[PDB]
Design a protein around this nucleic acid. Structure first.
Lengths: 52, 47, 50, 50
DNA sequence: GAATCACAAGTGATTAG
DNA sequence: CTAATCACTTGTGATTCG
DNA sequence: GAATG
DNA sequence: ATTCG
């Protein structure tokens, strides 16, 4: 529901990690944002699971 | 190589924003950690 | 005309993919590649129209 | 077959217009020329990728 | 089918702490 | 000095035109 | 691919 | 069958 109604934010990550994701989303599907979303969700599900 | 701007869900960002404000840290550090951990998990041979 | 926008055009997915990879690996973006690609084509084939 | 989906891309609007205008005079379309320009670009710069 | 559009995703530029 | 956010740029599925 | 003797 | 996108 918060996923639904809310929108975007931006954050600056290590360019070397971002470059990896760029190559990857290029070769295989997807895009930078949806990896970030997933990387972040999994972190929260790992370290902060009461928040999801 | 420094940083690159990326977009993320505002609802997840917010969760990190609230938590790093309450307890230690900032958002960028967490996002970098998550990303790094994501990559080690799913794209281990990269980096 | 520093100012100067884009028109959009639909290109072979297989070629687009090749460029998508390359511009990620190395520098650049898709438009950038198209802008150069097209100017070279015009210079090569109809340079008197520039 | 030899069939291939497409992917939308941005391009310098002046260069597009040169092609639009020139293809108008005869039969052609802008897409045909873009596909050709992109390819000649890839053959020139990335010959082993296609 | 080619050509176009509207918004989504990308990111250098810029401001807040 | 950086993290954080802005606002201009690119990207492209969806849509139009016919 | 919808219509212009 | 061809024009217009």
């Amino acid at each position: 529901a918060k996923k639904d109604i809310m929108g975007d934010k931006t954050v600056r990550v290590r360019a070397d990690l971002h470059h990896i994701i760029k190559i990857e989303t290029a070769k295989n599907g997807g895009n930078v944002k949806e990896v970030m979303d997933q990387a972040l969700e999994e972190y929260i599900r790992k370290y902060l699971p009461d928040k999801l």
